[PDB]
């Protein structure tokens, strides 16, 4: 979801989440938050987020 890995099939734009393949609506936006300022995130997440 952070990487925007849309899979397009006809008009259905799926994205995998757990078992389900859900339809990405255009309006979706997510903001991640951290109250802890002492955190070491993985390099996997750093490339996927600003």
């Amino acid at each position: 979801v952070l990487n925007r890995e849309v899979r397009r099939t006809g008009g259905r734009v799926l994205i995998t989440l757990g078992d389900q393949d859900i339809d990405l609506s255009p309006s979706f936006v997510i903001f991640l938050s951290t109250r802890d300022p002492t955190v070491e995130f993985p390099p996997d997440l750093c490339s996927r987020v600003t």
Binding site: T16, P43, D44
Partner: protein, 1595 residues
């Protein structure tokens, strides 16, 4: 769905679907509005059903509620029938008026439940002790009002000591009460149940009559003991008669009352005159009574009278001490504090009320004795610390505060509180606070304590968790405030109904009640109760005085010196001896030891008395007791109780400490001549050494004797030695020896508890359709209890041969305790009979609870109880008398002959092996070649833990095969059999060869050479005389002389059809050695195991060697983290079958005359439990060692007949692996398959390349020069790059096979090539297999230079510029053939295809730069190869997961990606693998199976994939009807491809080949920063199986 619709209401595009959404919202709400009610209407009904049909008497108690529940049950059953006829949710929702009907049912069921709760609360309040009883138990009590026997088990919860009620023969009148010990109190006035039919009424009358009769008997007891109080001399007979006539509690109370009254009268009489004569008289009387009791206790007494005498002695010693203190202090007034501070008893018989007759006073406190029957309780030695505890606690009770005796563990805190409560006659109820804290009854228990009047002590209140601590703290705070409200003077108690808020009700609090909170510092009491509780530091109890009083109680003449010696000795043992969990030098152990010493003393008195009586003598118990050593009895008791638990390292330290504390006193072991003779006979019968102590085998004989002693004493015991110490053999010998000694048949029931599930072990209750299924242990217990075949006459021992864990021993705690009762969820209570003895074998008790260890006796079988000499003697004895070929039919005939006369020449095999034992005896001596070799080998490091018995069993099996080989030579040379000279040379060489392959068979080649050098130093046998060859490289021929293994390895030629998949292994030196060992260790049916680094070749060698044998039927099972005994049971059900025989049920393969062998490819990989045991490994261990297992469904023993196991492994150092149990590694001989090395690789790939070059006939001459290069560079890489620099720099022959496959696929479509083109393809494959995995640029430069160097070295006169240009690229897109292409043309083609890809699948620009075209080509290349799996590792981003998709789209591979959910069990991954495999193989649809680290979080499912990566088929996926469907689709696909196949095996092989060709796996990972993940660095097997590509970061 409701939340999602509510969220959809906020969507900007919601207006279009609004009306439809609203409709569903209504339906969704209605569905919830139904089922939220429905579950309630179900639960209450189920609950009410469980109450209204379980008891038939509930109808009479609650008729109206019964009728309402009948009318409700009918309606609910009708509704449920209607639902059953249409179980759809929408069909159910549309039932007419279902909502109103269910609401009516909920309301009425709630009303009936409320009525039942009110009725039960009324019954509880009528007889308050029921508040200590649970709801189901109270319902059982009231319902079974007419079946009084069922009530007998619940009295232990309600009353302090009443275990049962004595009843008239017709059960209409209660005559008295009885304790656990059998002590009975007969009521003066019986309670007539017929006149008071209600349970509460006659139970209240029983309590009242118990108190009245106890008071009336205490009156008579005091009246009688007053005579002894005022008498100068006491007649022992009258005193003993008085003790017998009255209960222990009344006896001690009478003694205390008499002493208190006598001292009070004395102090009144002295009255300021200073005349101390009356106190001297009191002390004289007390001393006379003490002398009478000391004389009486040495005699033999019944147990109850002995307990009464011990209590009286313990009380009178304290009375003597107090009177001596008063005389020394010159106390001369009854109101002096020195007398008031001592507890005093004032009995006023004239009081009409029977609860204010005895008044117990201490300083201010003035309690009354609540006459609650306590039975024969354990009295406490009134030390000064306990006296302080009593004083402070009574002061706190007088001030209405709570009590808090805090201190370290085992300091008498809870026991002291219990003793104080029992001294005042108040019911104490200790609440444990260690994971058994039943909260749901705690409010009920508090209300019961408040209403009835009873104490409550929380043992270790610190151990409650924070929520539990806070809630209980609040409840106790409310109770303590209610109690403190009594103390105020203004509140007049004529009308003062004190109350407390408990369970949202005003509960009346009686003043007699109190609460105590024991604490363990390290700490403080909760802040709620710090003000309300008085704390006392019970830091250090008085060990010396407790020991003194107890030893005096047992009749020891000297107690002061013995106590002062034994007490420091225990602390000395606690400090000096090595800390172990099972050691227990606490006060409970000391008191038990002293009681044992008293028992031993009394036994010695009886022994001397009977010995003198058989002679002519005059007998007196006191005279015999006078001239005995008390120290010898005490040291004997200490040794008998402690030495069995002592480790061999600690026994000499213990003896040194005992000599220091007890100088000049030694413990001579009691001689058991008969048992020792029987042990000698059985040991000779079973080929075991026996010794008379301090000889070869003395320690083992001593340990079995100790085992006999512990079995005699306890009803449950354990053997907790390390693996290979003879505990199981010792127990077997003991049973077979007692069989002869006592003429009682010994039966053994051996159970592996961890192999079987707890539900099967103890039997599980069906949650519905109530029926009981007996578990295995319960089945055995029921079988012995019923005694259909007279099992009570026989003696049966149950042995739990497996690791002890808390989970499966919870039910066994009740049996192992003094109760001896197994309780099951069925409600049945099985009484263990005296014949049963529950036994345990454990390598260690690391995960055993202290509760389990305390209940059981123990004999620690230290590893130095079985010397090497004993095992060698066992081996040589087995050889001389067990024919090695006759098998099991003649096993029974071994017992037919007591000596087997005339059967010395049973067969030529016996003679040959006897001669072999004669040749082998000089090398098996205590300081022979084998012993020195083993001691040196123990120094060497081995990948698996080196245990002595594993090496010895391996060596014995190899020697067995040596004599079998001699027998084979004799059979093949009937005209002249083996001569003794050739036999001597052959066995002498074979012993060295077997020594090397048994000891250094688990080590590397260098260490095998080291052991060979050491053997060459110490051996007298000649060895090979070739300098630069290891000894292990040589075989021993049938003739004595050595011969190199290289002669026996043929040079073969492989077909071009199978150049990279000849599953038949190319014969190499390691392969021939390992198959020779495989045959040698399979001849004995031992479970072989092979370890080694990934790709070493163990699986192929095992399969080829097993399939070479004609009889062996291989079943390929692959183990994983989730594998269990179920896999092996399913495999047995598939290939094998159970058949009944008179010996017993036997499991055998369906195919006659074939040995079924199970391949367990990854024995290490199964996950350990929380307690460090693999279930399947234990299951295999019990099968291989006991030769069978227990069918759980039938709960019956079955024996394997032709089943074997042979496993493969990676070393346990690898991340996903685990070490194996030492009880399991003992049986299996482990071989280490290291990498082939240069010579073996050259031979193998010479065969492969000679096969590969057959396609082009002009390049055959260049086969051998190429093969060295493929080896040389590979070895150079193996020397330059190691796992230390990067975790994925792993090399193995799998890389070489990939190289061969790559060259083969390059050359297959090509009609011809020049030598330079072959060199170019070789260099390209080198770069694509080795240069890609590298991380650093300079390493890539080194590989670039080294490829050129190796090529020009092995291909001279070939110009480098034409043969190998640096920008080497091979591609198939430009032309139909796989031929070299230029960079620019490939750049243009890929750019065009990428621009196409932009507007086809994903609209995001993708730039082609120099370092991404190369990755595109690499990914395409791995896609073209067979079994081509890629592992892209690199920085986050950089193209992985985007290049893989791009190349997959370009090559037409449909991309499949796994979607892991939560609760995504391994079955879901199995189904996904089944679907993709069916698509790839049956439908011939190429798939790129992309996997990412995000969905590869769990490593459990990534070992199912390793089988696919290595072989392309994962056995066990399609088992069942899925196999039939896959076979049908597979044959349809084969017909589509044009091949007609019939056999299922050939169709499966073709399906596997299709899966190899089509399905590809693309793993994507980040570099090794995933330490937090379970993978850490993923397994090196995964690195080996795939082709690794380092993506790196953009330059």
């Amino acid at each position: 769905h409701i939340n999602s619709v509510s969220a959809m209401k906020l969507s900007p595009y919601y207006k279009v679907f609004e009306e439809d959404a609203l409709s569903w919202e209504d339906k969704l709400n209605r569905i919830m509005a139904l089922f939220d009610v429905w579950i309630d209407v179900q639960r209450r009904w189920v609950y009410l059903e469980g109450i209204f049909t379980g008891s038939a008497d509930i109808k009479h108690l609650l008729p109206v509620e019964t009728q309402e529940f009948q009318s409700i049950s009918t309606e609910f059953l009708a509704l449920m029938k209607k639902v059953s006829k249409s179980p759809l949710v929408m069909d159910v929702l549309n039932i007419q008026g279902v909502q109103r009907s269910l609401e009516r049912l909920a309301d009425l069921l709630g009303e009936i439940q409320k009525a039942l709760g009110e009725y039960l609360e009324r019954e509880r309040s009528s007889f308050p002790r029921f508040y200590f009883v649970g709801d189901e138990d109270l319902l059982e009590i009231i319902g079974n009002s007419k079946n009084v026997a069922k009530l007998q088990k619940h009295f232990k919860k309600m009353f302090a000591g009443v275990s049962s009620i004595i009843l008239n023969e017709d059960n209409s009148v209660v005559l008295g009460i009885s304790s656990r010990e059998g002590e009975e109190v007969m009521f003066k006035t019986p309670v007539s149940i017929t006149e008071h039919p209600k349970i509460n009424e006659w139970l209240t009358l029983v309590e009242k009559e118990m108190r009245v009769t106890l008071a009336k008997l205490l009156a008579e007891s005091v009246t009688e003991v007053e005579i002894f109080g005022k008498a100068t001399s006491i007649d022992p007979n009258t005193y003993i008669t008085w003790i017998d006539k009255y209960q222990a509690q009344l006896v001690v109370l009478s003694a205390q009352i008499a002493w208190s009254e006598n001292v009070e009268t004395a102090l009144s009489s002295m009255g300021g005159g200073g005349d101390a004569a009356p106190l001297h008289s009191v002390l004289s009387n007390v001393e006379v009574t003490l002398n009478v009791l000391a004389d009486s206790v040495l005699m033999e007494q019944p147990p109850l009278r002995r307990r009464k005498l011990e209590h009286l002695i313990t009380e009178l010693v304290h009375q003597r001490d107090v009177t001596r203190s008063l005389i020394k202090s010159k106390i001369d007034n009854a109101k002096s504090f020195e007398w008031l501070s001592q507890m005093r008893f004032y009995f006023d018989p004239k009081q009409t009320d029977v609860l204010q007759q005895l008044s117990i006073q201490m300083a201010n406190a003035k309690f009354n004795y609540g006459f609650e029957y306590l039975g024969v309780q354990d009295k406490l030695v009134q030390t000064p610390l306990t006296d302080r505890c009593y004083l402070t606690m009574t002061q706190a009770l007088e001030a209405r505060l709570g009590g808090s005796p805090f201190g370290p563990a085992g300091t008498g805190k809870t026991e002291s509180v219990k003793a104080l409560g029992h001294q005042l006659g108040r019911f104490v109820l200790v609440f444990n606070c260690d994971e058994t804290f039943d909260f749901q009854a705690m409010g009920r228990i508090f209300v019961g304590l408040c209403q009835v009047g009873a104490w409550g002590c929380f043992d270790e209140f610190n151990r409650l968790e924070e929520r539990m601590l806070s809630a209980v703290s609040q409840q106790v705070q409310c109770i303590q405030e209610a109690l403190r409200e009594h103390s105020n003077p203004n509140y007049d108690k004529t009308s003062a109904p004190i109350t407390c808020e408990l369970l949202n009700k005003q509960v009346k609090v009686s003043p007699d009640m109190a609460i105590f909170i024991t604490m363990n510092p390290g700490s403080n009491l909760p802040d709620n109760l710090k003000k309300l509780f008085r704390s006392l530091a019970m830091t250090k109890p008085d060990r010396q005085l407790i020991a003194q009083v107890m030893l005096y109680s047992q009749g020891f003449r000297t107690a002061e010196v013995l106590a002062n010696k034994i007490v420091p000795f225990f602390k000395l043992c606690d400090e000096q001896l090595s800390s172990q969990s099972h050691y227990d030098f606490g006060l409970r152990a000391l008191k038990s030891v002293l009681v044992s010493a008293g028992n031993v003393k009394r036994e010695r008195i009886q022994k001397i008395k009977r010995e003198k009586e058989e002679r002519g003598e005059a007998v007196d118990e006191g005279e015999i007791a006078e001239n005995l050593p008390e120290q010898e009895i005490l040291i004997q008791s200490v040794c008998e109780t402690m030495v069995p638990k002592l480790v061999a390292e600690d026994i000499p330290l213990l003896f040194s400490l005992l000599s220091d504390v007890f100088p000049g006193v030694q413990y001579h072991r009691g001689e058991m001549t008969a048992l020792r003779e029987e042990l000698k006979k059985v040991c000779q019968e079973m080929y075991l050494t026996y010794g008379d102590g301090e000889e070869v085998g003395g320690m083992w004989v001593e340990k079995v004797l100790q085992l006999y002693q512990i079995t005699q004493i306890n009803h449950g015991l354990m053997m907790v030695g390390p693996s290979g110490s003879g505990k199981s053999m010792a127990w077997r010998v003991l049973l077979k020896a007692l069989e002869r000694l006592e003429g009682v048949e010994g039966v053994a029931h051996i159970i592996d508890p961890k192999a079987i599930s707890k539900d099967h072990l103890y039997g599980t209750l069906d949650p519905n359709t109530r029926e009981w299924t007996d578990g295995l242990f319960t089945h055995v217990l029921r079988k012995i209890i019923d005694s259909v075949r007279g099992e009570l006459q026989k003696r049966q021992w149950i042995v739990f041969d497996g690791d002890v864990d808390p989970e499966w021993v919870e039910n066994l705690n009740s049996v192992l305790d003094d109760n001896k009762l197994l309780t099951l969820p069925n409600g049945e209570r099985l009484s263990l009979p005296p014949n049963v003895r529950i036994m345990f074998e454990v390598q260690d008790l690391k995960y055993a609870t202290l509760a389990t260890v305390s209940r059981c006796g123990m004999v620690w079988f230290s590893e130095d109880v079985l010397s090497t000499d004993m095992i060698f003697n066992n081996f040589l004895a087995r050889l001389r008398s067990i024919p090695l070929d006759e098998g099991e039919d003649e096993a029974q005939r071994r017992r037919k002959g007591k000596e087997d006369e005339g059967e010395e020449a049973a067969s030529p095999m016996l003679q040959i092996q006897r001669d072999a034992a004669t040749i082998m005896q000089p090398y098996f001596t205590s300081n022979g070649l084998v012993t020195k070799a083993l001691e040196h080998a123990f120094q060497l490091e081995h990948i698996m833990d080196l245990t002595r018995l594993r090496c010895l069993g391996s060596l014995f099996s190899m020697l067995h095969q040596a004599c079998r080989n001699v027998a084979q030579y004799n059979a093949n040379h009937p005209d002249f059999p083996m001569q003794i000279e050739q036999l001597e040379r052959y066995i002498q060489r074979y012993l060295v060869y077997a020594i090397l392959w048994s000891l250094s068979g688990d080590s590397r080649l260098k260490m095998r050479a080291e052991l060979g050098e050491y053997i060459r130093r110490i051996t007298t046998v000649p060895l090979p005389t070739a300098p630069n060859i290891p000894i292990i490289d040589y075989e021993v021929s049938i003739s004595g002389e050595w011969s190199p293994w290289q002669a026996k390895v043929p040079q073969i030629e492989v077909e071009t059809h199978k150049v990279a998949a000849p599953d038949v292994v190319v014969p190499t030196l390691d392969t021939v050695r390992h198959e020779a060992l495989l045959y040698t260790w399979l001849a004995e049916h031992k479970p072989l195991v092979l370890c080694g680094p990934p790709g070493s070749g163990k699986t192929m060698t095992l399969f080829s060697a097993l399939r070479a044998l004609p009889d062996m039927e291989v079943v390929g099972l692959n183990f994983s983290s989730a594998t269990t005994p179920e896999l092996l049971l399913k495999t047995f059900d598939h290939y094998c079958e159970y058949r009944r025989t008179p010996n017993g049920v036997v499991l055998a393969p369906v195919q006659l005359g074939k040995w079924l062998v199970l391949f367990c490819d990854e024995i290490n990989l199964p996950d350990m439990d929380k307690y460090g045991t693999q279930r399947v490994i234990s299951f295999i261990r019990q099968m291989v060692e006991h030769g069978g297992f227990y069918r759980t469904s039938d709960q019956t023993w079955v024996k394997l007949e032709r089943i074997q196991f042979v496993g493969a492994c990676n070393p346990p150092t690898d991340p996903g692996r685990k070490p194996l149990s030492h009880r399991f590694l003992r049986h299996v001989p482990v071989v280490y398959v290291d990498y082939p090395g240069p010579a073996s690789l050259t031979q193998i790939y010479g065969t492969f390349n000679r096969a590969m070059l057959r396609l082009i006939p002009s390049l055959r001459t260049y086969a051998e020069p190429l093969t060295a290069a493929m080896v040389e560079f590979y070895t150079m890489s193996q020397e330059r790059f190691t796992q230390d620099t990067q975790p994925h720099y792993i090399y193995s022959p799998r890389e070489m096979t990939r190289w061969v496959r790559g060259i083969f696929e390059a050359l297959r479509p090509l009609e011809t090539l020049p030598v330079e083109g072959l060199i170019r393809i070789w260099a390209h494959e080198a770069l694509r297999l080795f240069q890609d995995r590298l991380v650093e640029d300079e390493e890539r430069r080194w590989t670039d230079e080294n490829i050129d160097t190796v090529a020009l070295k092995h291909f001279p006169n070939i110009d480098r510029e034409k043969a190998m240009s640096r920008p080497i690229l091979y591609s198939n897109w430009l032309s139909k053939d796989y031929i070299p292409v230029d960079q620019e043309e490939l750049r243009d083609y890929v750019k065009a295809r990428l621009k196409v890809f932009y507007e086809e699948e994903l609209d995001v620009p993708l730039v082609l730069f120099n370092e991404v075209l190369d990755h595109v080509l690499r990914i395409d290349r791995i896609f073209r190869q067979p079994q081509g799996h890629l592992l892209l590792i690199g920085v986050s981003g950089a193209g992985k997961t985007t290049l893989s998709r791009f190349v997959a789209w370009m090559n037409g591979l449909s991309v499949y990606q796994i979607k892991v959910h939560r609760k995504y069990t391994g079955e879901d991954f199995d189904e996904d693998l089944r679907t993709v495999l069916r698509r790839s193989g049956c439908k011939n649809e190429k798939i790129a199976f992309i996997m990412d680290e995000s969905n590869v979080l769990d490593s459990g499912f990534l070992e199912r994939m390793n089988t696919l990566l290595a072989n392309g088929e994962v056995p066990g996926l399609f088992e069942g009807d899925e196999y039939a469907t896959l076979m049908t689709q597979c044959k349809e696909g084969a017909q589509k491809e044009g091949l007609m196949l019939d056999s299922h095996e050939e169709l499966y092989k073709w399906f596997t080949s299709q899966v190899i060709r089509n399905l590809h796996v693309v793993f994507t990972m980040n570099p090794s920063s995933e330490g937090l993940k379970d993978r850490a660095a993923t397994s090196p097997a995964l690195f080996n199986r795939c082709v690794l590509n380092w993506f790196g970061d953009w330059s």
